[PDB]
């Protein structure tokens, strides 16, 4: 994907994702309940948008999702076994 410069401080996850999707200028759409009451360590630096979103989501229990159109979503982290 493309890259963007991010300067997102640590804090509650939901406002951080509002900031992320604006800094990346992306269509990001996901269920409100999924991100309520979670937190992020933030994201500061230049990153590919997909890698930056995964870093923002570290520790949250969520991962980024994408489909056939250029939009992004979020989902509970995939089981690995």
């Amino acid at each position: 994907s493309a890259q963007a410069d991010f300067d997102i401080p640590a804090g509650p996850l939901a406002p951080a994702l509002a900031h992320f999707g604006q800094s990346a200028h992306i269509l990001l759409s996901y269920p409100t309940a999924l991100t309520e009451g979670r937190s992020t360590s933030g994201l500061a630096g230049r990153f590919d948008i997909d890698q930056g979103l995964a870093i923002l989501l570290a520790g949250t229990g969520l991962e980024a999702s994408r489909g056939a159109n250029a939009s992004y979503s979020l989902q509970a982290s995939a089981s690995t076994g």
Partner: protein, 213 residues
């Protein structure tokens, strides 16, 4: 002395630079009349929504934004003003703005940065903190943080010619996301997919979001 009238079409954002160097961005379907005189730099927001940025730093006259509901007097401020049918909403990002409701102009209500307030001619209607540093529309985006679906689609419809609605059973569903304004059809489709809704679109200018059956 300098005057001008401006308007933006549905779906249009416009950048103006006023005679003093103050920058104004007009959002969709907006109308602004400007009248500078010896007393004041007068902006009249007749319809819609605008962002004032880069205020002139050393003009001796105050900057006044008036709507039918009252006056916003700017002290070096960067701020958004949106006119609704029954109130005006101001959001301050830098500096401070004095709100003077038409029928209760004194004492002014001081809004500092990170504050948003709605008022009518009578006075304040709501007031809250905001973390935004600029309105999302001014960077070509809509941003929703748990916004009720009915209110989200009211906002999005401002950018489109046709009618956009949701079934009443859906009116409070919370919308979260960021949405580039470049393609509003994509916004509708993405929100409907996230909320597991059907998009009824039987005539070009009438779109209803409905429960999946």
């Amino acid at each position: 002395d300098w005057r001008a009238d401006y308007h933006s079409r549905i779906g249009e954002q416009r950048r103006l630079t006023l005679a003093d160097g103050t920058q104004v961005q007009l959002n969709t379907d907006s109308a602004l009349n400007v009248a500078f005189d010896q007393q004041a730099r007068r902006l009249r927001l007749v319809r819609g929504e605008m962002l004032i940025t880069r205020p002139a730093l050393a003009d001796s006259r105050p900057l006044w934004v008036d709507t039918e509901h009252g006056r916003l007097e700017s002290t070096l401020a960067q701020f958004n003003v949106r006119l609704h049918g029954q109130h005006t909403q101001a959001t301050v990002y830098q500096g401070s703005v004095a709100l003077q409701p038409a029928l209760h102009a004194y004492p002014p209500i001081l809004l500092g940065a990170g504050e948003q307030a709605s008022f009518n001619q009578q006075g304040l209607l709501a007031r809250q903190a905001v973390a935004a540093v600029a309105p999302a529309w001014s960077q070509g985006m809509l941003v929703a943080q748990g916004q009720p679906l009915a209110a989200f689609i009211e906002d999005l419809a401002r950018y489109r010619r046709g009618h956009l609605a949701c079934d009443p059973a859906l009116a409070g569903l919370r919308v979260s996301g960021t949405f580039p304004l470049e393609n509003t059809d994509k916004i509708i489709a993405a929100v409907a997919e996230t909320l597991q809704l059907e998009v009824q679109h039987f005539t070009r200018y009438w779109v209803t979001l409905k429960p999946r059956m």
